[PDB]
Amino acid sequence: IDTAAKFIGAGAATVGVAGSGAGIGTVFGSLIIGYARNPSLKQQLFSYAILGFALSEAMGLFCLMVAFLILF
Amino acid sequence: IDTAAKFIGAGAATVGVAGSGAGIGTVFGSLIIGYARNPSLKQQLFSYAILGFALSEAMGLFCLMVAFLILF
Amino acid sequence: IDTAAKFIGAGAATVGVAGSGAGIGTVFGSLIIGYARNPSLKQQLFSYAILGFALSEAMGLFCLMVAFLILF
Amino acid sequence: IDTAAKFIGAGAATVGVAGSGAGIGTVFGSLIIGYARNPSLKQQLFSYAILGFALSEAMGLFCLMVAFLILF
Amino acid sequence: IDTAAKFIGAGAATVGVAGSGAGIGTVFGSLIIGYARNPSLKQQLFSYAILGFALSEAMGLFCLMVAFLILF
Amino acid sequence: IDTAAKFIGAGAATVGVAGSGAGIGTVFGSLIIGYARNPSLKQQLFSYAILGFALSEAMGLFCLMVAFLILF
Amino acid sequence: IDTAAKFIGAGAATVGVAGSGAGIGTVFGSLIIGYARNPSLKQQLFSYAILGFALSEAMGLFCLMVAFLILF
Amino acid sequence: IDTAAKFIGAGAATVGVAGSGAGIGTVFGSLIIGYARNPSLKQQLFSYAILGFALSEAMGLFCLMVAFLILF
Amino acid sequence: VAYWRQAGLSYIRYSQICAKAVRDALKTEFKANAMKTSGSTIKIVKV
Amino acid sequence: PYVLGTGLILYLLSKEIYVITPETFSAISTIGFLVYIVKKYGASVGEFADKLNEQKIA
Amino acid sequence: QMSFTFASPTQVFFNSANVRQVDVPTQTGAFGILAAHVPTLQVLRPGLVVVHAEDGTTSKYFVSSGSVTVNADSSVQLLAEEAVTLDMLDLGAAKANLEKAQSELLGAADEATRAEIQIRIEANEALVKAL
Amino acid sequence: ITPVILGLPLVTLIVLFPSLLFPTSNRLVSNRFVTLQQWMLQLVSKQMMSIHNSKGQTWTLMLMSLILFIGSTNLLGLLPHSFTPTTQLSMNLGMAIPLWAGAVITGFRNKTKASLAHFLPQGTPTPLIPMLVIIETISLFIQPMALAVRLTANITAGHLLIHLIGGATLALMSISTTTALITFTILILLTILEFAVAMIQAYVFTLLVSLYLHDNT
Amino acid sequence: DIKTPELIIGVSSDRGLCGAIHSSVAKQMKSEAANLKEVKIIGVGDKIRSILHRTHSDQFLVTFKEVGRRPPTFGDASVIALELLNSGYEFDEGSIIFNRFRSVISYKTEEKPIFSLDTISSAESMSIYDDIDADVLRNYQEYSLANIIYYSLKE
């Protein structure tokens, strides 16, 4: 009970990292279509894409910390 | 059962952070494909992106407090 | 079992807040890419931004009502 | 077991409202992009947005019916 | 074991409707944004949105029949 | 346990049709916005929408094979 | 316990094909609107669609490699 | 409980690969809808597509290392 | 917008530089004609 | 042609020397290999024409 | 089909010709404007005019600027400021100009000044591109 | 011993003959023989050189050796069976150090603390944030190097599922064949379409990543 | 067609009225000037700047010369277009009045109107239009300013 449902509690916490993975593509894919309109590569759009990669992988960090919480 | 299923209930409540993570990728992507049209970087489009990432991780803080209620 | 399943059932309805948090990322995204087209920023588009974020957070407030009902 | 699994099943059906929530944002977001292209806001395009919120909440009322049947 | 697992089997089978509701928001959005570019609305295109809202709900009747199979 | 885990396990495999459900609405959605750009409807474009609904229901048919393996 | 949790745990890994099936509708849909703007059908565009679906169903074949390793 | 919960704990962490599955389809799909606008295919766009696919399989390199930790 | 448009320029300005740029290009024979083609035999009278 | 034959032999050795699949699986892989061949043998001639001409030209 | 008018002040290539397509790099993008377009206005990016007449042939021109305007109706008018065939377009010059173009660019100035080069760079390049 | 010891040598030799044969083709013969095989590295120097340099000749052949080695290694797991489930996995773990070391040679060896200083200073990793540089040092190496192990295991699985679905399809329909033959036929060919392609693309990832390293190096 | 309830520009050679060119426009432009467009004139031809030249030393924006001496070319049109752009037109509804030649023996004094009100050019029916941006809009207006210019002038 104490050792059992802590193992099945970390696994479902790792499913919360499915938003960051599909969030990473929809944020670095809109910038893959932004420079297709051109020409702010290494200027404004690619600079904000890192500020878009950080806002999405943080919701993956705040979810991997719950998965590490139910593991140690 | 009592001291078990709450540890596997905080894992399922952390799956709600797949919308706050994939909602940020949709928000901070259209404000990268929209700034490619230009030239409302400051004051308008990125200012609305602060109010776009405010109602995106609002479903995630409400999902991080639901898991926090099934732990502390 | 009788006390165990309510805790495991509250987290499972908290995973239904992943659809409302990304539906707010699509509505505010397509308004951020709907204001770049210009020019009726006030009214029309951003006035229907709260009208599109009301029917999309309506699925979250009903889901977090089914998650709270198994807790109280 | 029988009075237990009804609470760990009615909660998993509320995770079916993730498509009703993210479907309401996508159908309204492209309506906010379609009315940004102008001009038939009053009927034709936003009238069809009601015919898109109905065929998207129908897969959210049929999923909320199965969750209510396993709780009452 | 026999009476319980059939209630936690039609609950996880209702999480297959999370695509039939969001995919209908994707097709009816692309018909909402598609008719904006004009002019085939009362023919051709909105007659293809009925053929899209059916194929999306085709995995919403196939998934719903499995949740109706585990129950009755 | 032997008749229990195969009855709750056949329900979890039915969450693989949520991908083919929304994946069918997108391939039929981009064909609605594609034929809006006109005019190679019959052949080329709408002949590729079958090639896009077949590679998407292939993972659906792969997921509906798994849920029927624990049911029979 | 050693055989029971191997039948309900091979069902949770079948929900990892939800990304390969919804992603395939995005790798072919963004190829439908891609050749709509035209004209490089054979080579360049559809050649990049094959190298994209292979990197989309790879997370479906590896997820069916962790599914069949729990039942066989 | 100890060995039993290690089987339905790496299976729930295998459904985290659904974010990387559709995220690779959203990234490579945008590159197929980007080189269609032309012509910076060689470098610039497809070179950035290798930066977006690595940052989407990064969540796939952290979710598959989680399920492989609860195995051996 | 552009490094031109926002440098003002014009589609004309742009264009002309293109147009010109083509005039700059072309094979020499064709460059003979160049000056004919979209020259400007003008006194630009300022009023 | 000679190269192709050598490559086939090596595979067979590997299958026999190494751990083996089921007979059905194996039979198929061999069939699967065959299908590529017929296009390939026409292709292999075509390959030949290109490179040795490009070598000769340079 | 479309009255495709491929014209230039100096050159009309097609004149209301029932052409199936022109692939058309307006600065808007490269598109395959097909026989009978939607009201749309287009700015010509330097690119090629790829003139898919209803004939299988698709003709090259490299275009500098102008408009194609792809109409409400089926008239497409490429109104080319100057759209010329690679036949008459000298790579020897183009490339040469183009390297140079960047070189000059390096000593250029404002958005505009740089632009004059850059535009050119872009242009010449797009010719160089083309050929 | 012989099986494990025989496998790695066998792998080498298939790459070694092409790697000896093309060096050989630089004057003789050619007859049928030499020209035929010159075809092999000319397909490498044709196909892969269409992508390479790129990073420049200096790194080019260094990476192409690993790319060819990976594709050839997995081709040497293609053919042999049983081989994929054991030897190709040991070869994937034996390719794991080469995949790890490929970044190590120049990246971690010259800068362990920030091998992204060779790989990607600004991009995925935030150059403003040395924390994210070290975090994405995992997603650009520590992980990508674990992915390169998972990538071969991704192949192993798909290759496995072909055998399993196959053997299960023929086990299901042990008709001799009959209708399972048609599908089973595909299930094998799926070995090529799945493993032999994704295998390839797998090393193509190590290619491109070790290119993006050495190309910015 | 994009028409408002609300410039002018003579066009000709610098050389005399070898027809009724200058006088015609002169007439009709004086006819104009009262009515409100904008009374901005551009005279292509400075024999425009004759016929009207007084408070058409004061209603012009510019006037053009070396009109002929090698027939006008697009360049010119663009040229005149270009500087035109950078003008203190408060781009009303502009007119270009020129004599469109009709045949060897016939010409017609023309006007066309310039949808210099780019906004009429934005408006209405002009909607269905795509690439609709006040960019390509303007940036067509631009291009067309030369095109038309060229033409008219040539006429």
Numbering used by the authors:
A (entry chain M), B (entry chain L), C (entry chain K), D (entry chain J), E (entry chain Q), F (entry chain P), ...: 2 to 73
I (entry chain I): 1 to 47
J (entry chain T): 1 to 58
K (entry chain H): 15 to 145
L (entry chain W): 10 to 226
M (entry chain G): 56 to 61, 67 to 96, 101 to 219
Task: Quote the paper.
In the mammalian enzyme, the subunit composition is α3β3γδε for the F1 region with subunits a, e, f, g, A6L, DAPIT, a 6.8 kDa proteolipid, two membrane-inserted α-helices of subunit b, and the c8-ring forming the FO region.
3D classification of the images resulted in seven distinct maps of the enzyme, each showing the complex in a different conformation. Initial 3D classification produced three classes, each of which appear to show a ∼120° rotation of the central rotor within the F1 region of the complex (blue arrows), similar to what was seen previously with the S. cerevisiae V-ATPase. Because there were two sub-states identified for states 1 and 3 there is only a single sub-state to sub-state transition for these two states. The largest change between the sub-states of each state can be approximated by rotations of the α3β3 hexamer relative to the rest of the complex by angles ranging from 10 to 16°. All of the sub-state to sub-state transitions include a slight rotation of the c8-ring against the a subunit. The different sub-states do not appear to have a specific sequence or represent specific intermediates in the catalytic rotation sequence. Instead, the differences in conformation between sub-states when taken together illustrate the flexibility of the enzyme, a property that has been linked to its rapid rate of enzymatic activity.
